[PDB]
Amino acid sequence: TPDDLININMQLQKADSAVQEVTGLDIKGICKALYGTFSSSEKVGIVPVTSIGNFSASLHAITQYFGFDSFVTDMPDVSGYYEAVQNGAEIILMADDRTFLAHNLKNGKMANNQPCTGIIYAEIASRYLKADSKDVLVVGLGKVGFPGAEHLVQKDFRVYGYDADETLLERATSNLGIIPFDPANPKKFSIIFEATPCANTIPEAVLSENCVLSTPGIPCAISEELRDKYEVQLIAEPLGIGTASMLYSVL
Ligand SMILES: NC(=O)c1ccc[n+]([C@@H]2O[C@H](COP(=O)([O-])OP(=O)(O)OC[C@H]3O[C@@H](n4cnc5c(N)ncnc54)[C@H](O)[C@@H]3O)[C@@H](O)[C@H]2O)c1
Ligand SMILES: [Mg+2]
Ligand code: NA
């Protein structure tokens, strides 16, 4: 509500700075570099869906920050959708338990939260100013991680991948031509991308001093101890960066 407004706005400004530190660009600039696209106060309708609407309030906060004219509809679901279109929304933003989408009504473009999150976090990791090599470790090759790994291959990085499910590791190896990472033969990285719903997924063996860990993952892949010891540059934010990615991907 009131101090939460300050709280979300703080967390976004922090993340923006962490992104500036690592890449030289802010989140706005990353999206501009990623999609060749820019905010022009487009009207975005945030429609709550049945699946107390605090998530939509966060999205309102987040979209305001990036220079969009956003609103939350009074009605939820289909009534909400209708209210949004009728009130001049150019982009619809909405989520249920399994899908979070942004739909641009002007141009027909639609984004899914998961690939957009994976692409932007991978992009941020790839742009690490003080990285020594083009080698990158991706841990987690699910709905967020696989598209992030794909983005990294297309930017001609040498991508190593690991997933706890051999099945998903196999898929990525075949589809993307990434190198399977073996914990029995680790290697140090200066660039790490992690898309896992688990903590302590990044072993100490893999870390180098002043590496970037870029992770949308909840909770955090590295312990506070290890990120202190290695002075790990941490890119992690729970909703805003992914949301910006979506919005900018559809403009
Ligand atoms: N911060 C954001 O803005 C944002 C946006 C979208 C998703 N997320 C988060 O990103 C995370 C991943 O989302 P997703 O859709 O890719 O999940 P997913 O379930 O589709 O895939 C996650 C992958 O991580 C793998 N994994 C789990 N534990 C592992 C371990 N110990 N070592 C290696 N791999 C492991 C799983 O096998 C799975 O393939 C989730 O925690 C999700 O909440 C964050
Ligand atoms: Mg995010
Ligand atoms: Na994680």
What single string gives the DSSP state of each residue in the chain? --HHHHHHHHHHHHHHHHHHHHHSS-HHHHHHHHHS------EEEE-------HHHHHHHHHHHHTT-EEEE-SS-HHHHHHHHHHTT-SEEEEE-SS-EEEEETTT--EEEHHHHHHHHHHHHHHT-TT--SSEEEEE--STTHHHHHHHHHHTT-EEEEE-SSHHHHHHHHHHH-PEEP-TTS---EEEEEE--S-SS-S-GGGEEEEEEEE---SS-SS-HHHHHHTT-EEE--SSHHHHHHHHHHH-
Ligand 1 atom 30: residue of nearest CA: 164
Q: Rounded to whole angstroms, how far apart are CA atoms 218 and 99?
A: 17
Annotated binding site: 49, 52, 95, 143-144, 163, 198, 216, 218, 237
Q: Is 243 exposed, middle or buried (0-12, 13-18, 19+ CB in 10 A)?
A: buried
Which is it for strands 233-235 and 207-214: parallel, antiparallel or unpaired?
parallel
Q: Rounded to whole angstroms, how far apart are CA atoms 205 and 94?
A: 40
Asked whether 191 and 211 are in contact (CB, 8 A), the reply is yes
Asked whether 139 and 165 are in contact (CB, 8 A), the reply is no
Closest CA to 72 of 110, 44, 40: 44
Between the CA of residue 16 and those of 7, 136, 235, 236, what are the distances in Å?
Answer: 14, 22, 9, 10
Asked whether 113 and 242 are in contact (CB, 8 A), the reply is yes
Instruction: Give the experimental resolution in Å.
Output: 2.5
Residues with CB under 6 A from ligand 1: 113-114, 117, 139-145, 162-165, 168, 195-198, 201, 216-218, 238-239, 241-242
Between the CA of residue 23 and those of 39, 160, 211, what are the distances in Å?
Answer: 20, 21, 13
Ligand 1 atom 38: residue of nearest CA: 142
Q: Rounded to whole angstroms, how far apart are CA atoms 82 and 131?
A: 48
Q: Rounded to whole angstroms, how far apart are CA atoms 18 and 184?
A: 32
Q: Which atom of ligand 1 is nearest to the CA of 218?
A: 41
Q: Rounded to whole angstroms, how far apart are CA atoms 2 and 118?
A: 31
Between the CA of residue 189 and those of 134, 144, 168, 175, what are the distances in Å?
Answer: 9, 20, 22, 23
- CB atoms under 10 Å from CB of 171, counted, come to 15
Q: Give the determination technique.
A: X-ray
Q: Which amino acid is at 12?
A: L
Closest CA to 226 of 245, 206, 241: 206
Q: Rounded to whole angstroms, how far apart are CA atoms 54 and 48?
A: 9
Q: Which amino acid is at 160?
A: Y
Asked whether 241 and 15 are in contact (CB, 8 A), the reply is yes
Q: Domain 1-112+237-251: which CATH class?
A: alpha beta
Q: Which atom of ligand 1 is nearest to the CA of 100?
A: 6
At 179, list the tokens. Answer: 């190198």
Phi-psi region of 215 (alpha: psi -120 to 50; beta: other; left: phi over 0): beta
Q: Rounded to whole angstroms, how far apart are CA atoms 227 and 211?
A: 9
CATH 3.40.50.12150 boundaries in the chain: 1-112+237-251
Q: Which amino acid is at 122?
A: A
Ligand 1 atom 18: residue of nearest CA: 142
Closest CA to 15 of 247, 235, 251: 235
Q: Ligand 1 centre and the CA of 193: distance in Å? A: 11
CATH 3.40.50.720 boundaries in the chain: 113-236
For the CA of 238, the nearest ligand: 1
Distance between start and end Cα atoms, the chain: 29
Q: At what angle do helices 113-126 and 27-35 cross, to 10 degrees?
A: 100
Ligand 1 atom 15: residue of nearest CA: 143
Q: Does domain 113-236 have CATH number 3.40.50.2300?
A: no
Q: Is 198 exposed, middle or buried (0-12, 13-18, 19+ CB in 10 A)?
A: middle
